[PDB]
Amino acid sequence: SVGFGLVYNSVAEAKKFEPTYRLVRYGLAEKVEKASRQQRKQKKNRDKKIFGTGKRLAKKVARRNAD
Amino acid sequence: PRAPRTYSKTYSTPKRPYESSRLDAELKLAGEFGLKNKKEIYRISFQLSKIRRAARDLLTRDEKDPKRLFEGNALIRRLVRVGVLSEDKKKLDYVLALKVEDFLERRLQTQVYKLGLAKSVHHARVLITQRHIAVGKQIVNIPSFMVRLDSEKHIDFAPTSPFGGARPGRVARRNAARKAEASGE
Amino acid sequence: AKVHGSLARAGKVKSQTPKVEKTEKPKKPKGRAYKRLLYTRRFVNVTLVNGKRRMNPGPSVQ
Amino acid sequence: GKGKPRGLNSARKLRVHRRNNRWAENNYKKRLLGTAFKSSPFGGSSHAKGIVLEKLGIESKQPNSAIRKCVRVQLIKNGKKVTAFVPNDGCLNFVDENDEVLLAGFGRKGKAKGDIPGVRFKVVKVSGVSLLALWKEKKEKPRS
RNA sequence: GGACUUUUACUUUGAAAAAAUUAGAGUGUUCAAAGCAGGCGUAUUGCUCGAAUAUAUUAGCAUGGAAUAAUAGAAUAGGACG
RNA sequence: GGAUAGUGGCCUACCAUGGUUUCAACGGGUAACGGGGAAUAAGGGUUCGAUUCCGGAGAGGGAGCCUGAGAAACGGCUACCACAUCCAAGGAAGGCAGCAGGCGCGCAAAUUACCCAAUCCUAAUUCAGGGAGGUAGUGACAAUAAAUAACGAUACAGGGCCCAUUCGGGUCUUGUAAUUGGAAUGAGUACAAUGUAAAUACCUUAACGAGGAACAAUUGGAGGGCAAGUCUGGUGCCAGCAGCCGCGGUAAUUCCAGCUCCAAUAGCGUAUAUUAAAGUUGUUGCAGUUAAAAAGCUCGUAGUUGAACUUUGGGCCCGGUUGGCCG
Ligand SMILES: [Mg+2]
Ligand SMILES: [Mg+2]
Ligand SMILES: [Mg+2]
Ligand SMILES: [Mg+2]
Ligand SMILES: [Mg+2]
Ligand SMILES: [Mg+2]
Ligand SMILES: [Mg+2]
Ligand SMILES: [Mg+2]
Ligand SMILES: [Mg+2]
Ligand SMILES: [Mg+2]
Ligand SMILES: [Mg+2]
Ligand SMILES: [Mg+2]
Ligand SMILES: [Mg+2]
Ligand SMILES: [Mg+2]
Ligand SMILES: [Mg+2]
Ligand SMILES: [Mg+2]
Ligand SMILES: [Mg+2]
Ligand SMILES: [Mg+2]
Ligand SMILES: [Mg+2]
Ligand SMILES: [Mg+2]
Ligand SMILES: [Mg+2]
Ligand SMILES: [Mg+2]
Ligand SMILES: [Mg+2]
Ligand SMILES: [Mg+2]
Ligand SMILES: [Mg+2]
Ligand SMILES: [Mg+2]
Ligand SMILES: [Mg+2]
Ligand SMILES: [Mg+2]
Ligand SMILES: [Mg+2]
Ligand SMILES: [Mg+2]
Ligand SMILES: [Mg+2]
Ligand SMILES: [Mg+2]
Ligand SMILES: [Mg+2]
Ligand SMILES: [Mg+2]
Ligand SMILES: [Mg+2]
Ligand SMILES: [Mg+2]
Ligand SMILES: [Mg+2]
């Protein structure tokens, strides 16, 4: 078999310099659990609609139904 | 919008489809080299045509012509390193009269026949396409390998495969077990 | 010319040839094995002749 | 002499006199005038598809003698009416009225083939299945 | 010593030029289509060849040639040279 | 002069009557984006190029403009034209020739999947974003490699060169099997590792995986052109076949089939187009008395073409290249 190899001067300058997927291959980094590109994007877009905090806007909303 | 991964085709078919002459000659080459189909003859028949043209052209240049020399010797040089062009037909005039079998001769398959190993070009095939051969450390299962000069004396059975050490196959090993669990105990 | 001629016997002969099933037979070798067969068979053993040699002669002259 | 000019600067005439005469060349003219798109029942397209109007029994030209079994088709793409040969034995029992079929040409360059007059197209499919398959019982005509 | 064709055509040789494709050299992708890689060694901190070349027949530019074919010039001398 | 970033009839004012054309202007067609390029291989040519790169253009049709360095921008706005969605009937909103997907059209073209790991772009910016791109999916578009069996044993025929008087017979190697023998291998399937962003496949590899109803290859053809049946059964100018010639009316080598045989074979056939064959577009390179074709005749303009002659001969220098001979 033939591959490719690296040996970093100190563990530190690896963790810095290595791509973060090989990091997790070794355990040297956590497998971040995220929402799929679609869920992400779709959230980005739902947000696109709102101007400001919106923590304001839900006051606008909540006002209308409590009377 | 990538880059066109290029390709070309390796064969050509005959203009007259039913020359029983050519059809006869072809079949001889099929059984006297243990071939699969016509395309295996076609391929080389194409191959050969491109060589003779290349030659043909250079032969129309002047001798001592820069181009003729670099690429006339080059042609010959390749045709020698393979077993097609003999040690002193090393001219361009001889590469023209270069015949077909001249190539087909140097097949791994025909070569495996040409030194023990097989006793039959058909045995030779089913041996090659089954990891039962190695050029150097390299296992090679293509019947059309084209064996080179300095490569010739390195075609031996594999480091794996029963015919070369390391285990028997699994049909032998299947038998050693059926003479075992039954008659044994 | 005439264009509405009879259609009543469409399929005449096909529907009236007696069906007969194909006999079984040992499989014929496919691939390189076949051209082997064909080679050694057509010219190496050399069978029937006439001064021209014959592929498919029905029950000879005799 | 040779009846054509030779002059070093006669390119003009030669260039032109040939262009002027490519026209007696049929295939060229057909190609240039777009006949294929204009007259022709198909678009020019290798194949067309239409609906079967009636079964026709066309009688063969001499010296032969038979009923050649054809179909009248309403080509879907331009509603041109064109009659088509159903090949093989009793395959006319495979196509019906209002049936939608695929027609193709006869290999004869738009000329008619053999002893069948006015027919220049063959029926290759009917109701989306092949004809050959229907005939060799590899498939069934879908249950209209 | 530079500049120099009356005015052209023609022809030579170059320049400025894209890559991919084409032709074509190198290279054992296990063969091949391909790819443009790769190769050597103490393989415990290395060394090392490459990634060429041909092709464009229009026109333009530069240049060697002046055969062929056109073209200009002294005839009321309103000619040429100094 | 005005306008422009700026030249310019770009626009205006005034002034002239000019500009293009048989060396084809102008107008028409184009099932026309231009080129790099593709197919076809004696050559010369013929045909194609929506489409991986360059350039142009457009974003349902048109016009208009804002912002900005840059847009006459459309995942910007304004209007008309054409479509057309939501609605509490007052009103509001959309522009897939981006990616997927749907309808329609048709002979004709794939998943509403994963990801920024690579390639590279953007921004305030190593970080964010990117249906650019990459990955897998569908995928017999084309292309490459090339399994579907291999080797013995036995008994006959004998290729047996012989010995040799004869069913006598040396002895390998062809040919045949309702006769046997063990070896081999991956298609698969699958611990693992590898591969990957995560997967998947390939490469590698444990445990498995070959004896016929299997791991069973097909497509077309068998009169000529053209390779291969005058064998059998069916039909009887019917059904049907046949690019073309032709086959079929009772002994069909051409239909329907069985058997066998041929050809190409993981591919083979059909249709349309095109190229070679085509010296049947002919410059190379055709034809024209009678096969298709010399205008009834002559003049004549464009066009094509157009006698000969002007430094020829002699004499030298310089450094070059494949061959004489030889080591
Ligand atoms: Mg006739
Ligand atoms: Mg050391
Ligand atoms: Mg010059
Ligand atoms: Mg200006
Ligand atoms: Mg002015
Ligand atoms: Mg006027
Ligand atoms: Mg027109
Ligand atoms: Mg167009
Ligand atoms: Mg075009
Ligand atoms: Mg284009
Ligand atoms: Mg063009
Ligand atoms: Mg179009
Ligand atoms: Mg635009
Ligand atoms: Mg649209
Ligand atoms: Mg901006
Ligand atoms: Mg716009
Ligand atoms: Mg859009
Ligand atoms: Mg845009
Ligand atoms: Mg889309
Ligand atoms: Mg849908
Ligand atoms: Mg269809
Ligand atoms: Mg398709
Ligand atoms: Mg990225
Ligand atoms: Mg990023
Ligand atoms: Mg930070
Ligand atoms: Mg199989
Ligand atoms: Mg088996
Ligand atoms: Mg068959
Ligand atoms: Mg038959
Ligand atoms: Mg034939
Ligand atoms: Mg024959
Ligand atoms: Mg019969
Ligand atoms: Mg010439
Ligand atoms: Mg002629
Ligand atoms: Mg005449
Ligand atoms: Mg006249
Ligand atoms: Mg002259």
UniProtKB/Swiss-Prot annotation, chain A:
The gene it comes from is RPS24A
Q: What does this protein do?
A: Component of the ribosome, a large ribonucleoprotein complex responsible for the synthesis of proteins in the cell. The small ribosomal subunit (SSU) binds messenger RNAs (mRNAs) and translates the encoded message by selecting cognate aminoacyl-transfer RNA (tRNA) molecules. The large subunit (LSU) contains the ribosomal catalytic site termed the peptidyl transferase center (PTC), which catalyzes the formation of peptide bonds, thereby polymerizing the amino acids delivered by tRNAs into a polypeptide chain.
Q: Which residues of the full protein are shown?
A: 69 to 135 of 135
Q: What more does the record tell us?
A: There are 2 genes for eS24 in yeast.
Tell me where it resides.
Cytoplasm
Q: How does it assemble?
A: Component of the small ribosomal subunit (SSU). Mature yeast ribosomes consist of a small (40S) and a large (60S) subunit. The 40S small subunit contains 1 molecule of ribosomal RNA (18S rRNA) and 33 different proteins (encoded by 57 genes). The large 60S subunit contains 3 rRNA molecules (25S, 5.8S and 5S rRNA) and 46 different proteins (encoded by 81 genes).
Source species of the chain: Saccharomyces cerevisiae (strain ATCC 204508 / S288c)
* Post-translational modification comment from the UniProt entry: N-terminally acetylated by acetyltransferase NatA. Also partially acetylated by NatC.
What does the sequence similarity comment in the record state about its family? Belongs to the eukaryotic ribosomal protein eS24 family.
Q: What is this protein called?
A: Small ribosomal subunit protein eS24A
From Swiss-Prot, chain B:
Stated name of the protein: Small ribosomal subunit protein uS4A
The task this protein performs is described as: Component of the ribosome, a large ribonucleoprotein complex responsible for the synthesis of proteins in the cell. The small ribosomal subunit (SSU) binds messenger RNAs (mRNAs) and translates the encoded message by selecting cognate aminoacyl-transfer RNA (tRNA) molecules. The large subunit (LSU) contains the ribosomal catalytic site termed the peptidyl transferase center (PTC), which catalyzes the formation of peptide bonds, thereby polymerizing the amino acids delivered by tRNAs into a polypeptide chain.
Something else known: Present with 106000 molecules/cell in log phase SD medium.
- Name the domain of life: Eukaryota
> Where is this protein localized, as stated in its record?
Cytoplasm; Nucleus, Nucleolus
Q: Where is the S4 RNA-binding domain?
A: 106-180
| Keyword Ribonucleoprotein attributed | yes
Q: For the cross-link Glycyl lysine isopeptide (Lys-Gly) (interchain with G-Cter in ubiquitin), list the residue numbers.
A: 179
> Keywords on this record?
Cytoplasm, Isopeptide bond, Nucleus, Phosphoprotein, Ribonucleoprotein, Ribosomal protein, Ribosome biogenesis, RNA-binding, rRNA processing, rRNA-binding, Ubl conjugation
Q: Which organism is it from?
A: Saccharomyces cerevisiae (strain ATCC 204508 / S288c) (Baker's yeast)
The segments labelled Disordered in the record are 159-185
Matches recorded under SMART domains: Ribosomal_S4, S4
One GO location term (cellular component): small-subunit processome
CDD domains according to UniProt: S4 (cd00165)
According to its UniProt entry, the protein's GO biological process terms are: maturation of SSU-rRNA from tricistronic rRNA transcript (SSU-rRNA, 5.8S rRNA, LSU-rRNA); ribosomal small subunit biogenesis; translation
Record's family?
Belongs to the universal ribosomal protein uS4 family.
GO molecular function terms listed in the Swiss-Prot or TrEMBL record: rRNA binding; structural constituent of ribosome
Positions of modified residues (Phosphoserine):
183
Transcription regulation among the record's keywords?
Answer: no
UniProtKB/Swiss-Prot annotation, chain C:
A cellular component term from Gene Ontology for this protein is: cytosolic small ribosomal subunit
* InterPro entries reported for this sequence: Ribosomal_eS30
Q: Does the keyword Disulfide bond apply?
A: no
Residues bearing Phosphoserine are: 15
By which gene is this protein encoded?
A: RPS30A
For whether the record's keyword set contains Cytoplasm, the answer is: yes
Pfam families in the record? Ribosomal_S30 (PF04758)
UniProt keywords (A-Z) are:
Cytoplasm, Phosphoprotein, Ribonucleoprotein, Ribosomal protein
The identity of this protein, by name, is Small ribosomal subunit protein eS30A
Record organism: Saccharomyces cerevisiae (strain ATCC 204508 / S288c) (Baker's yeast)
Curated annotation (Swiss-Prot), chain D:
Assembly mode:
Component of the small ribosomal subunit (SSU). Mature yeast ribosomes consist of a small (40S) and a large (60S) subunit. The 40S small subunit contains 1 molecule of ribosomal RNA (18S rRNA) and 33 different proteins (encoded by 57 genes). The large 60S subunit contains 3 rRNA molecules (25S, 5.8S and 5S rRNA) and 46 different proteins (encoded by 81 genes).
One Gene Ontology term of the biological-process aspect is: maintenance of translational fidelity
The UniProt keywords, alphabetically, are: Cytoplasm, Hydroxylation, Isopeptide bond, Ribonucleoprotein, Ribosomal protein, Ubl conjugation
What does the sequence similarity comment in the record state about its family?
Belongs to the universal ribosomal protein uS12 family.
Covalent cross-link Glycyl lysine isopeptide (Lys-Gly) (interchain with G-Cter in ubiquitin), where: 55
CDD domains, per this entry?
Answer: Ribosomal_S23
Upper lineage is: Eukaryota, Fungi, Dikarya, Ascomycota, Saccharomycotina
Q: What is one GO cellular-component annotation here?
A: ribosome
Further comment? Present with 10600 molecules/cell in log phase SD medium. There are 2 genes for uS12 in yeast.
- Give any Pfam family that matches: Ribosom_S12_S23
Which residues, by range, are in coiled-coil regions? none
Q: Which Gene3D superfamilies match?
A: Nucleic acid-binding proteins (2.40.50.140)
Question: What protein does this entry describe?
Answer: Small ribosomal subunit protein uS12A
